[PDB]
Design a protein around this nucleic acid. Structure first.
Lengths: 80, 80
DNA sequence: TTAGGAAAATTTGTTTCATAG
DNA sequence: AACTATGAAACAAATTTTCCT
């Protein structure tokens, strides 16, 4: 359960730039976009994840390793 | 300013794990570690984020003919 | 084994908000 | 100042399938 540090979230947001760079302000915007989701989560969100996982083609269940897992299809994602 | 969608976040959670794949309940946790973080620090966020970029030296400022921007030095996270 | 129930997946159904005509 | 048509997204929920005792 390693929790989330500023350090990390910043890495994650910089790394979601088209170019692996972002302006302080864009970073706010990233944080803001995310603040703007976690309070406006529902009681059932586990329902919403199960749902999106089945529904979109970008998520594909494979069976390997410890148990059955979920993986992304970067291609299918790129079109949405 | 919009939320990110389930789909985006979910994609992310899948990716955090370096193996680019994770079970359902491994995702529920990523989501929690977020849920948590934002319940905790919804303070003067912005301010933190210049304090870190500067402090943690895995964050580096570079010049674009765009403008002055931040990148991560991935070779300077993990450890040294 | 084999149940039996619960967690995962999957499927349908409602409703909203945002776009081009 | 509709009205038409389209589609993402979120949410609820209803069934079926896998997985864990």
């Amino acid at each position: 359960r390693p929790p989330f540090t500023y350090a990390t979230l910043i890495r994650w947001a910089i790394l979601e730039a088209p170019e692996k760079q972002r302006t302080l302000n864009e970073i706010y915007h990233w944080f803001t976009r995310m603040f703007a989701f976690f309070r406006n989560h529902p009681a059932t969100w586990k329902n919403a994840i199960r749902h999106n996982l089945s529904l979109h083609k970008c998520f594909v269940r494979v069976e390997s390793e410890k148990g059955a897992v979920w993986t992304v299809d970067e291609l299918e994602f790129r079109k949405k």
